[model samples]
Target: GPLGSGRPELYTVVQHVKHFNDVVEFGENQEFTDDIEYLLSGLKSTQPLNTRCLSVISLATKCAMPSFRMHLRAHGMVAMVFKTLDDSQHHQNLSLCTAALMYILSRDRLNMDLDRASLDLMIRLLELEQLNEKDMNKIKEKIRRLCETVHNKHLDLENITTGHLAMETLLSLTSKRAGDWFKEELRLLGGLDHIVDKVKECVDHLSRDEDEEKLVASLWGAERCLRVLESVTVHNPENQSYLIAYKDSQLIVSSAKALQHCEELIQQYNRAEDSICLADSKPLPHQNVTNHVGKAVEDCMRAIIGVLLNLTNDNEWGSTKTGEQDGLIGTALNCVLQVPKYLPQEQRFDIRVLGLGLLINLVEYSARNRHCLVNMETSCQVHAVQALVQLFLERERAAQLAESKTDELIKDNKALQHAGKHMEDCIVASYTALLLGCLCQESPINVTTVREYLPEGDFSIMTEMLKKFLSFMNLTCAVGTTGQKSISRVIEYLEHC
Candidate 1:
């Protein structure tokens, strides 16, 4: 029942799985590989053993995801892979090689993020000789399958989607292992080259597609990945591996593409979204031009929050496209002032999730730019605060879910209760934390060098912005558990402040 606690027999299979990985990965043995089919066919074990078998296979497959990622590097031998267009090398061998590599490409396929490098490499090529028509068709079908599966999972209530996975990872990464992983990539995968190549590809895609909506989404993806990496690197700075100096590479390359695309997006927004052109003059309070910038505010807030999430997770964004990585934060933040109106109720759903994600990271990372959100205009700040309030209230479900685990959590792990109870506290504290962080003087601003493109607005307003924040902080306490300690802590903090 318990898989024969501490049983060596159950674990023996893991050895075989690892051995199979060692053989197939570097193409180790002829006889062993040929024998693999026989073992694989008869290897079916019963119940617990079957589970163990799957676990071994899953781990082995996971171990392979990073192997060929080096192919992306310009100088690494991994990058020297024979060009698919070239007929010189025997592609049949490369074909088998790539296949073995792919079989393990997504080992934890069910909930896996599907390595950015693997997915990116698959998409970048114009032609693939190592992949025959049948193989190409199969690969295309598989990718579509994965994408469709992910989409369906998102629609499902049970399974978690990539967004959840990314949000979770982003929350933990900044000031975690993200930085070290990045530095490790720099050392092993050609450091700056690895990140630069992906950025270049994204830029190229934007230049070609010119589809503004899609471009914004792409920028969102890239920004999240980078921020994640930066956070992880920062978190694990003892080893200090992620410090490869991304420099202005993110700006000059990725940001330029993002700027062009965002420019197009705003122009498109004006045409369709009933935008009030402030080209004439800045409006205050109730500008007759935009009685309410709700829809515009919603989009701007969504864009800003989306950029925040992308930057929130930052590093692992895994886009292999051209001009499609990073640089939306400035555009999104600037877009806030352009709109003198409001965010639609429906669009708030998207913005709410993004804002929650940003809030989560702000609590953990305390990133310098994390709280500089104060600099945003009045309406933008209003929507952002309301969005945070709505989000904390929304996640009351997570609290419920956490509650359901009570009996099991207590018997097996009381930490579940501790985590859940603290989470209520976390949500309140984090919301309060973001508001307070924005108010403090020394915070690293969300604004970067690229923000000069935005309309300059009232500087004094940011200081006063937290007064509005006070309202949300009050709402957080009011909405939380009637007498939870988290509620008291928040009130005490605000009261003393």
Candidate 2:
């Protein structure tokens, strides 16, 4: 029987509604606005605990439905949920409320202008201490069950934390539609500094942890914090200024240290692999462990570099000698020169591309940065210019090989995929050319270094590569009109030299 058959108990009604919403799909003619109104009323109640509990649970369940989300947004119920969230004292209610809010905010096409109070509540939820032991136990139990049902043997259930959810919610608020406003709001609320502090804490934990589980957990935590930082700092100069000068530039220093730590871990893995292969022994038992750690480290590096990329772009401090002094150029150079070599072939491209992008910004206007490229020697005794030239040549050769086979491979899907990858190679080559151009611009030392670093000191090879990359501009379309202009400027400089 429906609600009209008899007066049902409120708890039973809520449970029935939750189950119905979970399993049934409502049609266009069905009106669930009244159901939503009832739930909102329950969420507003405070007299009986059971009523509030049932309402929040049912609301959270209903939130999974798109129609319910639409109705909730139309009724302006997000604020009410936030209010309930503020008043709720128990962990269960708090979790349900947050979950409900997350669902409402998660819709990509939906735009909700979150107020300061709502943003503050989300930020406060980032603290892990807010979650009790019982909550953690329940979460772990759920993860265990999920792993068993899904047969995912390698899932690191311990790494998932409530902070991840909070970060994700913040990330949703910082989407393209509202990112600028959110950035300003975050600055006003001192949220940027708070996020940076969390990043520092995660970095500390990463450095101090000896256990593998703790290491991975810290890495996950750091990655999430970096993701949010990257989102908040994108073209937001106020937030960028705060982060750039925060704690005497501790964020930059910490990111550089994290990059170094990742390199060391990779080196350790390589050494172990080399020793075992040299002994003609079987594969290392810990290969999977290293691989898993490698993937985590790679993700962390990408997010860290993303934040740095946003921070360095179009910022005055990022272009001056201060950036160099803060290890910014050195970190970018390491990403360009050393990090990619140890990474697997497929993953190497992104790190190198991002690294080169950062270097491009760092050197575009700064004579000091251009000079650093020609002068600074990495751990392997390779100058940044030398590495760029080497990468340019390697990618050029690969692109040429693929270009030669384009006609032959055009019919096969896998070969076509290979050809597509070569397109990426061409893009990398163009980036290398652009970076070299930036390095050589108005910097005689860089120009001289570029000339001398050519094959057998033959300047023709450098020009030839530049011309070749220019020819690729049509096919790749990666180096835009501005890039072409920059390359022409470098060519002019080279011709006069």
Candidate 3:
């Protein structure tokens, strides 16, 4: 009774003789739509394991034939493949078949939504820990093929776009959890070069047009590409070298473009806010535009600045190390200070914090960078020191009020949310403290200006906070050889203050 007692009708591997019969009758012109329909339809039944595997594998082969492919899609093969991958037991046959079909879907040029979905499916398959050596090879090869094919295709900005999908796929593959050999192969395949080239192209496009539509499209492309770069280069020395290979103008373009975009949106946001306040009778039609634009501007700026944060390390770009006439250094400071003061409090936090970190790097690099901060005029045509001091006080007060919040109060701040990290917040606070100490110690005029900026703010207030922040880093982080030097420099600065 147990043999076939309660089994569902489609639960057994029952192939009708009609499929073979029709194939012979019609030769190559056989309509296998019903075959696809039957297999997919059987998949939803409480089918036996081997039966389901065979049916899925069969459905996959059917999907390969051009005449039946679109008909198979009409039968919802995309969703079926996604489910097969999601639900199939980690058996080699099942995983291999579903992954292969999705790879084929990835090659279909007409539907990017399907292609992107399939791309995600393959990555998910690779992410599965249950994969054996053979399964792993299959997955990696398919993913590599999927990405390369997408990259070679045309970039249709209106649709999901192959380039965008390729970058995202490459980005997902670079996760630290991926196998080392997998990462090695990715590197050897020139994956880093591919990501950078596409991103550079995106930046070039973004800069080419002033039209809002094109700008939006270009920003979308850049967003995916930049995110991939961020993923691929996490503490990775190889990726760092690739990024360093970029020219000065290329690296600087993003910040300058983003800095300008943020300024324009903030202006628009202010006008919208004013209109809303003035007209109490009805909701201002432009208020929605203001909110969305601020968030969009926030996203683009945060991404590009995040890249700059990595690129500006040590002597990576020219020299934030010294000299008054350093155009790159000047632009970095200008981007910081010229960041409009009127930007909504939450809206301005990301760039301001990043700007401060960039400033700290310059100062610590050499004495000249400190001098630039005190004397140089930004592109926005203002001294950066006052702006730096202003942000310090704002963060200082916010820290006091939200003892539990840290950067958490700005948690919903869309841009910072895009790059939420406790370490990032802590870095901002630490750098602010270090910067104040640098200004207080660097020169007599610097000391006098800092003292005047907050007459009541003295050595102890700054010192206590400085050590408090430094202490956290000490407890959680394994500071290497540079520990004493960093601490000693700050101590010397505070002692002078």
Best candidate (score: lDDT): 2
Error of 1 at 150 (Å): 15
TM-score per candidate, in order? Answer: 0.38, 0.74, 0.55
Which scores better on TM-score, 1 or 3? 3
Query: 284-348, model 2: which lDDT tens digit per residue?
Result: 42577666676777888898888877877778684562355545577677777677666666777
* Clash counts for the predictions, in order: 51, 0, 0
Give the whole-model CA lDDT for all candidates, comma-separated: 0.36, 0.66, 0.52
> At residue 128, what lDDT does model 2 achieve?
40
lDDT of 1 by residue, 1-497 (tens): 64565657557667856765433334333443343334333323332333323332332233343332222121231212222212212233222223223323322221123233533342222112212355434433443343233222222221122322332332332223222333333334443344345444544565675443445444444443444334334334321223223443342345445444544543433322333555443333244323223223233244334433444343322111111334333343333323212232223234333444444443333443333343323332453333333333344445446566774566665766456554453344344334433333233232221122112422222223334445555777644354344434443433333
After the best TM-score superposition of candidate 2, give how far the Cα of residue 249 lies from its true spot, in angstroms: 2.9
Q: Rank the candidates by TM-score, best first.
A: 2, 3, 1
Off by over 4 Å in 3: 1-165, 179-190, 247-249, 253-266, 269-293, 315-348, 366-368, 378-382, 398-430, 439-445, 474-485
lDDT accuracy of residue 251 in candidate 2: 75
